Structure formats: C-alpha cells, structure tokens
Amino acid sequence: SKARVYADVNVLRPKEYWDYEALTVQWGEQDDYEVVRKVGRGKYSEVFEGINVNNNEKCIIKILKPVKKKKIKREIKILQNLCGGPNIVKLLDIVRDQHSKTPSLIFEYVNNTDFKVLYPTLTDYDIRYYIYELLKALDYCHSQGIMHRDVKPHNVMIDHELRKLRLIDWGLAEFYHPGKEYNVRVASRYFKGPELLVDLQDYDYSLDMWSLGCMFAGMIFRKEPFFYGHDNHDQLVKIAKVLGTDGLNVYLNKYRIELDPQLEALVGRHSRKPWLKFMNADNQHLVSPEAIDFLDKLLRYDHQERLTALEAMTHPYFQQVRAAENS
Ligand SMILES: Ic1c(I)c(I)c2[nH]cnc2c1I
C-alpha cells in the first residue's frame, strides 16, 4: 500500500526537512514564562495555563515527562514544520530546567471548552463548521508530509466565542515515506482504524480519516465514543458488528492478511447494520441524508477507499460553510 495523494512530499524536499534526528534545539529562556494553573495531563505530559512575563500575554505550558532524545526531536521538528498552517497549534518557544533538564514546550493560548460539556450544545450548523475547520488542518498537515495519528476530541481545542479551533498534541505524528512500515500502537483505542487492529503496517494519511469518521459518528449520533471496545481485539469486534463481516473478508484477502486464530474466532460472523439504525429522539435533528452519505464515505475498512481531507471539504454536507466563507 502507498498513499493515493501527497505520496512524494518528503521525497522532493531537502533531507533536513524530514531528517528530524539532525535537529539541534535552540533553547529559550525558562524565566520568560510562569505557570498560573494546571489545565490538563496525559501519559507523557502536564499542561498549564501560564503567562509570558515580558509582554503579559497568556500562553500554554506543556512540561514533558522523561522522553527519548529521538522521540522529542520528532515532535518539535513536526511542530516547527507546521507553525503557521490553518488551525495548527503554534509552538512559541522550547525551554528546560537547568538542574533537571526537564523540557517544556510553550504554545499560543486557546481558550477551550471541554468537549464533553460543549458538543451536546452544538447546533447542526456548528457541527458542520467545526468539522470543516478540523478538515483544514488535516489537509494542511497531509499536504506537508505528516500523519497526526491521534485525532480525537481531546486533541482538538475550541474557543466557542471566537469560533476558532486548533489541532493539538503532535506527540504521535510521523513523516509519511512511500513503502515504509509502521508501528500500529498509535491513536487511542476508540479511534484506531482497522489497519491497525489487523496489523497492516504500511498505512498512510487515511488513518486520520477513520478517526475523524469516529469523531463525527459520535457527534451526530450523540454517542461518545461511537465504537466502544474494552481492548484491541474487542475494538475490531465492535466495528465488525456495525460494518458486517463480509466487508472484512474482502479487505483481508485484498491485502492478504491472515487474521489471528483467536481474534477470528472472537469476530465471528455478522451482517451490515444500516447507519439509520442508530437514529433516535435525541439525535434526528442532526442526522440528515447528507450527514450519513458523508459518514459512510469516511468509515470503510479499506483505507484506500476513504475520502481524502481535500475531497471531504468539498462534499455538499459542507455547502453552507463554504458559502459563508466565499462571502
Ligand atoms: I485545556 C488544553 C489546552 I487550552 C491546550 I492549547 C492544550 N494543549 C495540549 N493540551 C492542552 C489542553 I488539556
């Protein structure tokens, strides 16, 4: 498998562009930025709102827990390569505690509202609008040779008042290289694509489109998360139960993938459940035939058959968003 678009971005660029192991960090000055309060955490960091002491601006300060040299230069390089693209988080500075050497990444401040409280108040139009904004970022980073590989609500910050959105947390992102084989322990479980669940290692950009489809399904059907498996074998069952097992078998054989004896036994046999079987009282104001057509074109086992970010921004599901813009 090779990507149907942008396949050659890193092939034509100077090696310094993608050879992140050759980066040397220009360290800024730790004292320019003071932590004000904690706002987030994860496996690999703590995240604080802070202040720039020179100008009195807000910022966000992301302190990293101990990380390999290699891993951390990948994140920074990708962040620098993409600074200035539409809806991509802006890295402002990189700094370190002198005594302990702990690195901190400094970012623009976004004034966010948690997805779990925000989404259930979003209108049909708002849903269209923010997915579109999110699609801008996706097309941008794919156009520059990068997969994000961790799309999900927790990683998309939104200031509902300014109607702005940024894609965050580039910790798991990689450069795309034609034919390169990749680690499948990426994305978070509810947003992992079939290719990862079955060990096809030569994935591309299209993985981020499955995750988006997951995020989308969850938003229109009011069902967080949409595919709810307890572990990686359960995640694939939970997909096969909606998409049906016929599609799976064609996928496997197309790419000649032997499934695992036990997994195959878990997955079983299941027919296709139509998208409309998920509509209910709480959700029918958000589910329309354009929403479903769009969703259907994102969630395909075959990664080569999903829409590109660039083809999705033009589906008629987003027509009114496009016309607000052109004016
Ligand atoms: I809340 C929040 C905000 I606002 C930004 I910007 C982040 N960047 C990484 N994690 C972040 C979290 I948690």
Coordinates of C-alpha atoms and ligand atoms in Angstrom, one line a residue:
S1 CA 0.0 0.0 0.0
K2 CA 1.0 3.6 -0.8
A3 CA -0.9 6.8 -0.3
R4 CA -3.2 7.9 -3.2
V5 CA -2.1 11.6 -2.6
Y6 CA 0.9 13.6 -1.3
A7 CA 2.9 10.3 -1.6
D8 CA 6.0 12.2 -2.7
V9 CA 6.1 15.3 -0.4
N10 CA 9.2 14.2 1.6
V11 CA 10.9 12.6 -1.4
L12 CA 11.2 16.1 -3.1
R13 CA 12.1 18.1 -0.1
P14 CA 15.6 18.6 1.3
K15 CA 16.6 15.8 3.8
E16 CA 16.8 18.4 6.6
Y17 CA 13.1 18.8 6.3
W18 CA 12.2 15.2 7.4
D19 CA 15.5 14.0 8.9
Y20 CA 14.4 15.2 12.4
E21 CA 17.3 13.3 14.2
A22 CA 19.6 16.0 12.9
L23 CA 17.7 18.9 14.7
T24 CA 19.6 20.9 17.3
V25 CA 17.2 22.7 19.7
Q26 CA 17.8 26.4 20.2
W27 CA 16.8 26.6 23.9
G28 CA 14.9 29.7 25.1
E29 CA 14.8 31.3 28.4
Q30 CA 12.9 29.4 31.2
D31 CA 12.2 32.6 33.2
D32 CA 10.1 34.3 30.5
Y33 CA 7.1 32.0 31.4
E34 CA 5.4 31.4 34.7
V35 CA 2.8 28.7 35.4
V36 CA -0.6 30.1 36.5
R37 CA -2.7 26.8 36.9
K38 CA -3.0 23.2 35.8
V39 CA -5.4 22.5 32.9
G40 CA -4.6 19.1 31.6
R41 CA -2.4 15.9 31.8
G42 CA -1.7 12.7 29.9
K43 CA 0.7 9.8 29.9
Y44 CA 3.5 11.9 28.5
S45 CA 3.0 15.4 30.0
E46 CA 1.4 18.0 32.3
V47 CA -0.2 21.1 30.8
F48 CA -0.6 24.6 32.4
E49 CA -2.0 27.9 31.5
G50 CA 0.7 30.5 32.1
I51 CA 2.0 34.0 31.5
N52 CA 4.8 35.5 29.3
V53 CA 6.5 37.9 31.8
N54 CA 7.8 40.3 29.2
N55 CA 4.5 41.1 27.4
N56 CA 1.9 39.8 30.0
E57 CA 0.2 37.6 27.3
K58 CA -1.3 34.2 28.1
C59 CA 0.4 31.1 26.9
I60 CA 0.1 27.3 27.4
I61 CA 3.0 25.5 29.0
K62 CA 3.4 21.8 28.4
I63 CA 6.0 20.1 30.6
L64 CA 7.2 16.8 29.3
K65 CA 7.8 13.7 31.4
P66 CA 11.2 11.8 30.8
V67 CA 11.4 11.1 27.0
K68 CA 14.0 9.7 24.5
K69 CA 16.1 12.2 22.6
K70 CA 14.8 10.8 19.3
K71 CA 11.1 11.0 20.2
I72 CA 11.2 14.6 21.4
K73 CA 13.1 16.0 18.3
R74 CA 10.3 14.3 16.1
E75 CA 7.6 16.2 17.9
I76 CA 9.5 19.6 17.8
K77 CA 10.5 19.2 14.1
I78 CA 7.0 18.5 13.1
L79 CA 5.7 21.4 15.1
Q80 CA 8.2 23.8 13.5
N81 CA 7.4 22.5 10.0
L82 CA 3.7 23.2 10.5
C83 CA 3.8 26.5 12.5
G84 CA 1.6 29.0 10.6
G85 CA -0.7 26.4 8.8
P86 CA -4.6 26.8 9.3
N87 CA -5.8 25.7 12.7
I88 CA -2.4 24.1 13.6
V89 CA -1.3 24.9 17.2
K90 CA 1.6 27.4 17.4
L91 CA 4.8 26.5 19.2
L92 CA 6.2 29.7 20.6
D93 CA 9.4 28.6 22.4
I94 CA 11.2 25.5 23.8
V95 CA 12.9 25.7 27.4
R96 CA 14.4 23.4 30.1
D97 CA 15.0 23.4 33.8
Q98 CA 18.8 23.7 34.1
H99 CA 19.2 21.5 37.1
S100 CA 16.9 18.6 36.0
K101 CA 16.9 19.3 32.2
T102 CA 13.1 18.7 32.0
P103 CA 11.8 20.2 28.7
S104 CA 8.8 22.5 28.3
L105 CA 7.0 23.4 25.1
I106 CA 5.4 26.9 25.0
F107 CA 2.3 27.5 22.9
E108 CA -0.2 30.1 21.9
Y109 CA -3.1 30.1 24.5
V110 CA -6.5 28.8 23.3
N111 CA -9.4 29.4 25.5
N112 CA -11.1 26.0 25.4
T113 CA -14.4 24.4 26.5
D114 CA -14.4 20.7 27.3
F115 CA -15.9 18.6 24.5
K116 CA -18.0 16.6 27.0
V117 CA -19.9 19.8 28.0
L118 CA -19.6 21.7 24.6
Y119 CA -20.7 19.1 22.0
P120 CA -24.2 18.4 23.3
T121 CA -25.0 22.1 22.8
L122 CA -23.6 22.4 19.3
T123 CA -26.1 23.1 16.5
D124 CA -26.3 21.2 13.3
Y125 CA -24.5 24.1 11.6
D126 CA -21.9 24.4 14.3
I127 CA -21.1 20.7 13.9
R128 CA -20.6 21.2 10.1
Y129 CA -18.5 24.3 10.8
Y130 CA -16.0 22.8 13.3
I131 CA -15.5 19.5 11.3
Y132 CA -14.7 21.7 8.3
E133 CA -12.2 23.7 10.4
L134 CA -10.7 20.4 11.6
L135 CA -10.5 19.2 7.9
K136 CA -8.5 22.4 7.0
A137 CA -5.7 21.3 9.5
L138 CA -5.8 17.6 8.3
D139 CA -5.3 18.6 4.6
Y140 CA -2.6 21.0 5.7
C141 CA -0.5 18.5 7.6
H142 CA -1.0 15.8 5.0
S143 CA 0.0 18.3 2.3
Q144 CA 3.2 18.8 4.3
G145 CA 4.0 15.1 4.6
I146 CA 2.8 14.3 8.1
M147 CA 0.2 12.0 9.6
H148 CA -1.2 13.2 13.0
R149 CA -2.1 9.6 14.1
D150 CA -4.1 10.7 17.2
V151 CA -7.2 12.5 16.1
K152 CA -9.9 12.7 18.7
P153 CA -12.0 15.2 20.6
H154 CA -9.5 15.6 23.5
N155 CA -6.9 16.7 20.9
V156 CA -8.9 19.4 19.1
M157 CA -9.2 22.7 21.2
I158 CA -12.2 25.1 20.6
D159 CA -12.9 28.7 21.7
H160 CA -16.6 28.7 21.1
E161 CA -16.9 32.5 21.4
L162 CA -14.2 33.3 18.8
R163 CA -15.3 30.3 16.7
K164 CA -11.7 29.1 16.4
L165 CA -10.2 25.6 16.6
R166 CA -6.7 24.2 16.8
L167 CA -5.4 20.7 16.3
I168 CA -3.1 19.8 19.3
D169 CA -0.7 17.2 20.6
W170 CA 1.6 16.2 17.9
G171 CA 3.4 13.6 20.1
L172 CA 2.5 10.6 17.9
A173 CA 2.8 12.1 14.5
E174 CA 5.3 10.9 11.9
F175 CA 6.6 11.7 8.4
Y176 CA 5.0 9.6 5.7
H177 CA 7.5 7.7 3.4
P178 CA 6.2 5.5 0.5
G179 CA 6.5 1.8 1.4
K180 CA 7.8 2.4 5.0
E181 CA 6.4 0.0 7.6
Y182 CA 4.9 1.5 10.8
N183 CA 4.2 0.8 14.4
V184 CA 0.5 0.1 14.9
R185 CA 0.3 1.1 18.5
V186 CA -0.7 4.7 17.7
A187 CA -4.1 6.6 18.1
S188 CA -6.3 5.9 21.1
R189 CA -8.4 2.8 21.2
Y190 CA -11.9 4.2 20.2
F191 CA -10.3 5.9 17.2
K192 CA -8.0 3.1 15.9
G193 CA -8.5 2.1 12.3
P194 CA -9.0 -1.5 11.1
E195 CA -5.5 -1.4 9.5
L196 CA -4.0 -1.1 13.0
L197 CA -6.3 -3.6 14.5
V198 CA -5.2 -6.3 11.9
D199 CA -1.5 -5.3 11.6
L200 CA -1.3 -3.8 8.2
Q201 CA 1.9 -1.8 8.9
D202 CA 2.1 0.1 5.7
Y203 CA -0.6 2.6 6.5
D204 CA -0.7 6.4 5.4
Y205 CA -2.7 9.7 5.9
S206 CA -6.0 7.8 5.5
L207 CA -5.8 6.5 9.1
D208 CA -6.6 10.1 10.4
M209 CA -9.9 10.0 8.2
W210 CA -11.2 6.8 10.0
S211 CA -10.6 8.6 13.4
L212 CA -12.4 11.7 12.1
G213 CA -15.3 9.5 11.0
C214 CA -15.4 8.0 14.5
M215 CA -15.5 11.6 16.0
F216 CA -18.1 12.6 13.5
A217 CA -20.4 9.5 14.2
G218 CA -20.1 10.2 17.8
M219 CA -21.2 13.9 17.3
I220 CA -24.2 13.3 15.0
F221 CA -25.4 10.1 16.8
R222 CA -24.8 11.6 20.4
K223 CA -22.9 8.5 21.3
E224 CA -19.4 9.1 22.9
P225 CA -17.4 7.1 21.9
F226 CA -19.2 5.5 18.9
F227 CA -17.2 2.3 18.8
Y228 CA -16.7 1.2 22.4
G229 CA -14.4 -1.8 22.8
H230 CA -12.5 -2.7 26.0
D231 CA -9.3 -3.8 24.3
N232 CA -7.8 -4.1 20.8
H233 CA -9.4 -7.5 20.0
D234 CA -12.8 -6.2 21.3
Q235 CA -12.3 -2.9 19.3
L236 CA -12.3 -4.9 16.0
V237 CA -15.4 -7.0 17.0
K238 CA -17.3 -3.8 17.8
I239 CA -16.5 -2.5 14.3
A240 CA -17.4 -5.8 12.6
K241 CA -20.7 -5.8 14.4
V242 CA -21.7 -2.5 12.7
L243 CA -20.0 -2.8 9.3
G244 CA -20.7 -6.6 8.9
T245 CA -18.1 -9.3 8.3
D246 CA -18.4 -9.7 4.5
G247 CA -16.6 -6.4 4.0
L248 CA -13.9 -7.5 6.4
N249 CA -13.2 -10.8 4.5
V250 CA -12.8 -8.8 1.1
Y251 CA -10.4 -6.4 2.9
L252 CA -8.2 -9.2 4.4
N253 CA -7.9 -11.0 1.1
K254 CA -7.3 -7.8 -0.9
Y255 CA -4.2 -7.1 1.3
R256 CA -3.7 -10.9 2.0
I257 CA -3.8 -10.6 5.8
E258 CA -4.0 -13.8 7.8
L259 CA -6.1 -13.0 10.9
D260 CA -5.2 -14.5 14.2
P261 CA -6.9 -17.8 15.1
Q262 CA -8.4 -16.4 18.4
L263 CA -9.3 -12.9 17.0
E264 CA -11.0 -14.6 14.0
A265 CA -12.9 -16.7 16.5
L266 CA -13.9 -13.5 18.6
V267 CA -15.1 -11.5 15.5
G268 CA -17.4 -14.3 14.3
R269 CA -20.0 -13.7 11.6
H270 CA -22.2 -10.5 11.4
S271 CA -24.1 -8.8 8.7
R272 CA -24.2 -5.0 7.9
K273 CA -26.2 -2.7 10.2
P274 CA -27.5 0.3 8.2
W275 CA -26.4 3.8 9.6
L276 CA -30.0 4.8 10.2
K277 CA -30.5 2.1 12.8
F278 CA -28.7 4.5 15.2
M279 CA -31.2 7.4 14.9
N280 CA -33.3 8.2 17.9
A281 CA -35.3 11.1 19.5
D282 CA -32.3 12.8 21.0
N283 CA -30.4 12.8 17.6
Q284 CA -32.7 13.1 14.5
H285 CA -32.1 16.9 14.3
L286 CA -28.5 16.2 13.4
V287 CA -28.8 13.1 11.2
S288 CA -29.7 14.0 7.6
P289 CA -29.1 12.1 4.4
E290 CA -26.0 14.3 3.7
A291 CA -24.5 13.6 7.1
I292 CA -25.0 9.9 6.6
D293 CA -23.6 10.0 3.0
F294 CA -20.5 11.8 4.3
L295 CA -20.1 9.4 7.3
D296 CA -20.5 6.3 5.1
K297 CA -17.6 7.6 2.9
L298 CA -15.2 8.0 5.9
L299 CA -15.9 4.7 7.7
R300 CA -14.7 2.0 5.2
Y301 CA -12.4 -0.9 6.2
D302 CA -10.4 -0.3 3.1
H303 CA -8.2 2.7 3.8
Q304 CA -7.7 3.2 0.1
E305 CA -11.5 3.8 -0.3
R306 CA -11.9 6.5 2.4
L307 CA -12.2 10.2 1.3
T308 CA -9.1 12.4 1.4
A309 CA -9.3 15.5 3.6
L310 CA -9.3 17.6 0.4
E311 CA -12.2 15.6 -1.1
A312 CA -14.2 15.8 2.2
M313 CA -14.1 19.6 2.5
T314 CA -16.0 19.6 -0.9
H315 CA -18.7 17.1 -0.1
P316 CA -22.2 19.0 -0.2
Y317 CA -22.6 18.3 3.5
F318 CA -20.4 21.4 3.9
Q319 CA -22.0 23.7 1.3
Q320 CA -23.3 26.4 3.6
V321 CA -20.0 26.6 5.4
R322 CA -18.2 27.1 2.1
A323 CA -20.6 29.9 1.1
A324 CA -20.3 31.7 4.4
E325 CA -16.5 31.8 3.6
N326 CA -16.6 32.9 -0.1
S327 CA -18.5 35.8 1.4
Ligands
LIG1 I1 -7.4 22.7 28.2 C1 -5.8 22.5 27.0 C2 -5.4 23.5 26.1 I2 -6.5 25.3 26.1 C3 -4.3 23.3 25.3 I3 -3.8 24.9 24.0 C4 -3.6 22.2 25.3 N1 -2.5 21.7 24.6 C5 -2.2 20.5 25.0 N2 -3.1 20.1 25.9 C6 -3.9 21.1 26.1 C7 -5.0 21.3 27.0 I4 -5.6 19.8 28.3

